[PDB]
Design an enzyme around this catalytic site. Structure first.
Site, PDB file in Angstrom:
ATOM      1  N   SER A  36       0.981  -1.201   0.087  1.00 57.11           N
ATOM      2  CA  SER A  36      -0.112   0.125  -0.093  1.00 57.11           C
ATOM      3  C   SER A  36       0.816   1.123  -0.004  1.00 57.11           C
ATOM      4  O   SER A  36       1.718   1.426   0.989  1.00 57.11           O
ATOM      5  CB  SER A  36      -0.943   0.053   1.254  1.00 57.11           C
ATOM      6  OG  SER A  36      -2.113  -0.957   1.010  1.00 57.11           O
ATOM      7  N   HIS A  67      -3.196   1.312  -5.063  1.00 56.53           N
ATOM      8  CA  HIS A  67      -2.678   0.393  -5.792  1.00 56.53           C
ATOM      9  C   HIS A  67      -2.950   0.478  -7.059  1.00 56.53           C
ATOM     10  O   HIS A  67      -4.282   0.689  -7.495  1.00 56.53           O
ATOM     11  CB  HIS A  67      -3.297  -1.148  -5.251  1.00 56.53           C
ATOM     12  CG  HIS A  67      -2.989  -1.622  -3.943  1.00 56.53           C
ATOM     13  ND1 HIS A  67      -2.256  -2.614  -3.587  1.00 56.53           N
ATOM     14  CD2 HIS A  67      -3.264  -0.861  -2.556  1.00 56.53           C
ATOM     15  CE1 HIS A  67      -1.630  -2.651  -2.355  1.00 56.53           C
ATOM     16  NE2 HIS A  67      -2.514  -1.614  -1.616  1.00 56.53           N
ATOM     17  N   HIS A  89      -6.218  -8.308  -2.368  1.00 62.67           N
ATOM     18  CA  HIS A  89      -6.475  -8.839  -1.120  1.00 62.67           C
ATOM     19  C   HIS A  89      -7.514  -9.528  -0.743  1.00 62.67           C
ATOM     20  O   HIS A  89      -8.619  -9.495  -1.649  1.00 62.67           O
ATOM     21  CB  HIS A  89      -6.560  -7.551  -0.179  1.00 62.67           C
ATOM     22  CG  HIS A  89      -5.450  -6.524  -0.233  1.00 62.67           C
ATOM     23  ND1 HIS A  89      -5.636  -5.499  -1.118  1.00 62.67           N
ATOM     24  CD2 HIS A  89      -4.281  -6.253   0.499  1.00 62.67           C
ATOM     25  CE1 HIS A  89      -4.467  -4.841  -1.151  1.00 62.67           C
ATOM     26  NE2 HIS A  89      -3.460  -5.263   0.031  1.00 62.67           N
ATOM     27  N   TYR A  91      -9.603  -9.282   1.844  1.00 62.38           N
ATOM     28  CA  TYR A  91     -10.626  -8.425   1.972  1.00 62.38           C
ATOM     29  C   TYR A  91     -11.839  -7.737   1.010  1.00 62.38           C
ATOM     30  O   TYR A  91     -12.734  -7.246   1.271  1.00 62.38           O
ATOM     31  CB  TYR A  91     -10.344  -7.278   3.124  1.00 62.38           C
ATOM     32  CG  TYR A  91      -9.329  -6.294   2.453  1.00 62.38           C
ATOM     33  CD1 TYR A  91      -7.939  -6.499   3.078  1.00 62.38           C
ATOM     34  CD2 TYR A  91      -9.551  -5.243   1.735  1.00 62.38           C
ATOM     35  CE1 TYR A  91      -7.206  -5.370   2.632  1.00 62.38           C
ATOM     36  CE2 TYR A  91      -8.833  -4.509   1.323  1.00 62.38           C
ATOM     37  CZ  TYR A  91      -7.460  -4.478   1.536  1.00 62.38           C
ATOM     38  OH  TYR A  91      -6.629  -3.664   1.192  1.00 62.38           O
ATOM     39  N   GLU A  92     -11.164  -7.626   0.023  1.00 61.76           N
ATOM     40  CA  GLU A  92     -11.573  -6.986  -1.318  1.00 61.76           C
ATOM     41  C   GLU A  92     -12.643  -8.127  -1.777  1.00 61.76           C
ATOM     42  O   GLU A  92     -13.441  -7.942  -2.995  1.00 61.76           O
ATOM     43  CB  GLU A  92     -10.563  -6.938  -2.396  1.00 61.76           C
ATOM     44  CG  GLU A  92      -9.658  -5.683  -2.108  1.00 61.76           C
ATOM     45  CD  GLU A  92      -8.607  -5.452  -3.031  1.00 61.76           C
ATOM     46  OE1 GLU A  92      -7.522  -5.969  -3.085  1.00 61.76           O
ATOM     47  OE2 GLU A  92      -9.109  -5.126  -4.207  1.00 61.76           O
ATOM     48  N   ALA A 119       2.663  -2.398   3.184  1.00 57.32           N
ATOM     49  CA  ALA A 119       2.597  -1.625   4.502  1.00 57.32           C
ATOM     50  C   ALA A 119       2.242  -2.502   5.615  1.00 57.32           C
ATOM     51  O   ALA A 119       1.880  -3.427   5.444  1.00 57.32           O
ATOM     52  CB  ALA A 119       1.388  -0.560   4.162  1.00 57.32           C
ATOM     53  N   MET A 222      -2.636  -7.274   5.916  1.00 57.13           N
ATOM     54  CA  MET A 222      -3.805  -8.144   5.621  1.00 57.13           C
ATOM     55  C   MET A 222      -3.448  -8.716   4.250  1.00 57.13           C
ATOM     56  O   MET A 222      -4.233  -9.034   3.377  1.00 57.13           O
ATOM     57  CB  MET A 222      -5.136  -7.374   5.208  1.00 57.13           C
ATOM     58  CG  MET A 222      -5.423  -6.415   6.511  1.00 57.13           C
ATOM     59  SD  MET A 222      -6.625  -5.268   5.941  1.00 57.13           S
ATOM     60  CE  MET A 222      -6.784  -4.338   7.628  1.00 57.13           C
ATOM     61  N   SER A 223      -2.262  -9.129   4.058  1.00 58.79           N
ATOM     62  CA  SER A 223      -1.713  -9.550   2.634  1.00 58.79           C
ATOM     63  C   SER A 223      -0.351 -10.434   2.917  1.00 58.79           C
ATOM     64  O   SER A 223      -0.212 -10.847   4.173  1.00 58.79           O
ATOM     65  CB  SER A 223      -1.340  -8.175   1.585  1.00 58.79           C
ATOM     66  OG  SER A 223      -0.059  -7.742   2.474  1.00 58.79           O
ATOM     67  N   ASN A 246       2.297   2.677  10.878  1.00 62.71           N
ATOM     68  CA  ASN A 246       1.484   3.353  12.012  1.00 62.71           C
ATOM     69  C   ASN A 246       1.705   2.383  13.289  1.00 62.71           C
ATOM     70  O   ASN A 246       2.117   1.137  13.079  1.00 62.71           O
ATOM     71  CB  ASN A 246       0.093   3.218  11.588  1.00 62.71           C
ATOM     72  CG  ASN A 246      -0.506   1.949  11.431  1.00 62.71           C
ATOM     73  OD1 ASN A 246      -0.194   1.379  10.310  1.00 62.71           O
ATOM     74  ND2 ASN A 246      -1.757   1.673  12.088  1.00 62.71           N
ATOM     75  N   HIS A 260      -6.535   4.457   6.701  1.00 62.34           N
ATOM     76  CA  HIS A 260      -5.790   4.325   5.285  1.00 62.34           C
ATOM     77  C   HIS A 260      -4.730   5.516   4.765  1.00 62.34           C
ATOM     78  O   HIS A 260      -3.855   5.493   4.225  1.00 62.34           O
ATOM     79  CB  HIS A 260      -6.646   3.953   4.285  1.00 62.34           C
ATOM     80  CG  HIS A 260      -5.955   3.307   2.970  1.00 62.34           C
ATOM     81  ND1 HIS A 260      -5.271   2.396   3.116  1.00 62.34           N
ATOM     82  CD2 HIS A 260      -6.445   3.522   1.648  1.00 62.34           C
ATOM     83  CE1 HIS A 260      -5.019   1.963   1.937  1.00 62.34           C
ATOM     84  NE2 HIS A 260      -5.485   2.619   1.023  1.00 62.34           N
TER      85      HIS A 260
HETATM   86  N1  LIG Z   1      -4.269  -5.216   9.514  1.00 66.38           N
HETATM   87  C1  LIG Z   1      -3.579  -4.142   9.739  1.00 66.38           C
HETATM   88  N2  LIG Z   1      -2.993  -3.877   8.478  1.00 66.38           N
HETATM   89  C2  LIG Z   1      -2.262  -2.790   8.394  1.00 66.38           C
HETATM   90  C3  LIG Z   1      -1.347  -2.435   7.137  1.00 66.38           C
HETATM   91  C4  LIG Z   1      -1.348  -3.004   5.836  1.00 66.38           C
HETATM   92  N3  LIG Z   1      -2.363  -2.573   4.712  1.00 66.38           N
HETATM   93  C5  LIG Z   1      -2.996  -1.153   4.840  1.00 66.38           C
HETATM   94  C6  LIG Z   1      -4.257  -1.385   4.440  1.00 66.38           C
HETATM   95  C7  LIG Z   1      -4.955  -0.204   5.309  1.00 66.38           C
HETATM   96  O1  LIG Z   1      -4.489   0.906   5.228  1.00 66.38           O
HETATM   97  C8  LIG Z   1      -4.741  -2.684   4.363  1.00 66.38           C
HETATM   98  O2  LIG Z   1      -4.460  -3.300   3.257  1.00 66.38           O
HETATM   99  C9  LIG Z   1      -3.628  -3.388   5.339  1.00 66.38           C
HETATM  100  C10 LIG Z   1      -0.947  -1.197   7.823  1.00 66.38           C
HETATM  101  N4  LIG Z   1      -1.358  -0.896   9.116  1.00 66.38           N
HETATM  102  C11 LIG Z   1      -1.982  -1.953   9.538  1.00 66.38           C
HETATM  103  C12 LIG Z   1      -2.762  -2.364  10.713  1.00 66.38           C
HETATM  104  O3  LIG Z   1      -2.667  -1.389  11.855  1.00 66.38           O
HETATM  105  N5  LIG Z   1      -3.540  -3.224  10.735  1.00 66.38           N
END
Ligand SMILES: Nc1nc2c(CN3C[C@H](CO)[C@@H](O)C3)c[nH]c2c(=O)[nH]1
Ligand SMILES: Nc1nc2c(CN3C[C@H](CO)[C@@H](O)C3)c[nH]c2c(=O)[nH]1
Ligand SMILES: Nc1nc2c(CN3C[C@H](CO)[C@@H](O)C3)c[nH]c2c(=O)[nH]1
Lengths: 288, 285, 287
Positions: A36, A67, A89, A91-92, A119, A222-223, A246, A260
């Site tokens: 990301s 993306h 992903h 989740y999509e 990310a 999540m990937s 973060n 995001h």
């Molecule tokens: N689950 C999770 N994923 C992420 C990500 C990675 N991706 C970042 C994007 C949401 O910003 C999702 O595709 C997961 C960065 N920070 C975090 C977090 O705190 N949690």
């Protein structure tokens, strides 16, 4: 309609591989998947050719920003590459057999190495945003409960029925990325730890962040894990890192929330430092 | 893959409700196993069968009446789910949570979720009320999340946060206001872990769940909460600890739904008093 | 759109009756034989063999070391039916197919089920070739949706909401334990928690650490669904693993878990298995 296997046949991966080979003269050895906001890793490739995912037969599309949803062939520091500018992903709504489609087409393309970036939320307390973490290892939570791209019939033209994931992260390149870091002029160390995959699309609660910490995970996202699993199953060398975007909230006092906008912005900030790191690394990747 | 409901489906449903009752709720209340008895205090109550309302799933477990009841509760305009839906019934979370997006389209701005729960914290007794301070979405971790699939901006954001999920105000308010219950049992606050069931835990499972930091276990609630926050509803949650989960091999006791419903019935008056005080705690629109 | 058993009551009955018509055996005990454990059928007497492909509604076994045969006969003078190989989630099976045989075993008159499997050792005390008696399990696919009981419940089989805290028979354990001092060894019988994980790929070191710290002594990829539906219909249940390999616990090790060594450890253990299973049969109560 009972059996849950790959919707993709072997000849499916082939058609796509072929199509690509008839549409570019490039012959990549290294495939790179850009997480990301890391889509900036394609900036430094030379003699680049771009394909929109929409063009490539069977390819899914990226629906999450940013993306870019494009496939890009180029040279990076002596090496022929193909880069995923944007990934897919769970989740999509994609099944992992879709999420991971490109990986086995890279293999049919003749890639022998895959690098995976993403990310990721900081779970370890001593990470800071902007830190690059070398993925030593992962914890596949969706994998435990049945969510695995390998599920269903297994094609031995690709790999084994029960392929071991305990050597998944190439040990050689870890050692080389480590000492290569003393070669950048960096304040922060190169970070190292375990990535835990979680399905999303919603962000961890405080208690959830705490199980993940307790589990030994250093970073959550999540990937990535599906893709690693299908890569190793076809015998690609695998190297991964996460950009710490973060620190996931680990107390009920904070009024900070994970989002995001903030993760895309930690990405634009670092993509510079990132591309350089990736660049010097290319000459470390072993020749076919 | 994706949610089987189009946006129009949720709309059709809301409009159906909006034109078959004159009631206009602010608070939505989901009633768990043996908590159906909380519609009893609704004044000017109007009742529907889930089977009347377009797209409504059915409640198939004993203790879940399958009825939607509009009324006023301690003055406040509520709509109550008398019975709910679980994943183990064979429902995709996009059916389990369906009503919640509709309530939002109704104009509901607050959701209270109630359940029965097994007690993981040795400190808890049957009959306790435990406020849901936080949850662990075990099924979420691996893909079972109602938000999975394309996101509709009309409801919320692709990546919504959940660390602020349970209204701190409403919990603290409920904590201070507890002395009016005339109880000797303190009010409990802890972590709800969702687990899909329908089978009950092993001793070994109980122990992972404990050492994961969770205070109570159930098979509901979390999906609803997740989609409520996705659309910006204020969320309050509580559990009736109906049983203490078995934590050693020499106990001959074992979890059963009958004991669950029995304890629901036992506490029916205490819940009703607690939920009444709670309607006095919700901010006005 | 409902996740749901694809089998009706009548399907379980169609299968059971077919077996009942085609065999004279009336089994009391059912045994499911895991990866590389097929040879447990060897000591059956007056045996009769059915290929799963002959049995209406029977799934088929695609993994190597799972023969795909249903074998009736006597063992230590008890009427058994043995599954020669089983089915796993990773093969693409819904848990309602994985566990299909168990309800038919039930309609057949079976009242005890013994589940067997191969497992990766998590507890540092276990040697390759140990038999760990399953005192308890951790059901991870179950935690997040994967349970063979998901969907409409058939009350003719059992409860909407069955307890699992008593799934592995205490008395059979104790009898099996104390009976072990004979054709026993300098090596004790192991006891502990099976954690089920879905696979098909093997644990990472990190995953191996989470399983350890979750309390689990052994890891496999099956069995637990079978146990859950067995208890659903009120069969007595006994389980055990063969520790076929130690799961990789540290990053410099060059060993990797592989199917081949799972099967080898099984063939290496045949005699001890045989002896144990028939010493188990003696510990099973009569109707
Ligand atoms: N689950 C999770 N994923 C992420 C990500 C990675 N991706 C970042 C994007 C949401 O910003 C999702 O595709 C997961 C960065 N920070 C975090 C977090 O705190 N949690
Ligand atoms: N998982 C779980 N849930 C519960 C519940 C909550 N609901 C009770 C009902 C079964 O009795 C299910 O729908 C979940 C009460 N006690 C327990 C327990 O020990 N375990
Ligand atoms: N998860 C897991 N399962 C097993 C098993 C049990 N089965 C063995 C077979 C792979 O060879 C799968 O069906 C699982 C043996 N060893 C191991 C291990 O190390 N890990």
């Amino acid at each position: 309609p009972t059996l849950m296997e790959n919707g993709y046949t072997y000849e499916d991966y082939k058609n796509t591989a072929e199509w690509l080979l008839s549409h570019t003269k490039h012959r990549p050895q290294v495939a790179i998947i850009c997480g990301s906001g890391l889509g900036g890793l394609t900036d430094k490739l030379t003699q680049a050719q771009i394909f929109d995912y929409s063009e490539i037969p069977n390819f899914p599309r990226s629906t999450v920003p940013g993306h870019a949803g494009r496939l890009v062939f180029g040279f990076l520091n002596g090496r022929a590459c193909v880069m995923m500018q944007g990934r897919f992903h769970m989740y999509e709504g994609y099944p992992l057999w879709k999420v991971t489609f490109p990986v086995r087409v890279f293999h049919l393309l003749g890639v022998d190495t895959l690098v995976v970036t993403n990310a990721a939320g900081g779970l370890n307390p001593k990470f800071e945003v902007g830190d690059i973490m070398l993925i030593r290892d992962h914890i596949n939570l969706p994998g435990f409960s049945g969510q695995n791209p390998l599920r269903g019939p297994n094609d031995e033209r690709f790999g084994d029925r029960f392929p071991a994931m305990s050597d998944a992260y190439d040990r050689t390149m870890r050692q080389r990325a480590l000492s290569t870091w003393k070669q950048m002029g960096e304040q922060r160390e190169l970070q190292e730890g375990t990535y835990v995959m979680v399905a999303g699309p919603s962000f961890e609660t405080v208690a959830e962040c705490r199980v993940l910490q307790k589990l030994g995970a250093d970073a959550v996202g999540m990937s990535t894990v599906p893709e690693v699993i299908v890569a190793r199953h076809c015998g690609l060398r695998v190297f991964g890192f996460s950009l710490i975007t973060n620190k996931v909230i680990m107390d009920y006092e904070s009024l900070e929330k994970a989002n995001h906008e903030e993760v895309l912005a930690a990405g634009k900030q670092a993509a510079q430092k990132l591309e350089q790191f990736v660049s010097i690394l290319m000459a470390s990747i072993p020749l076919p």
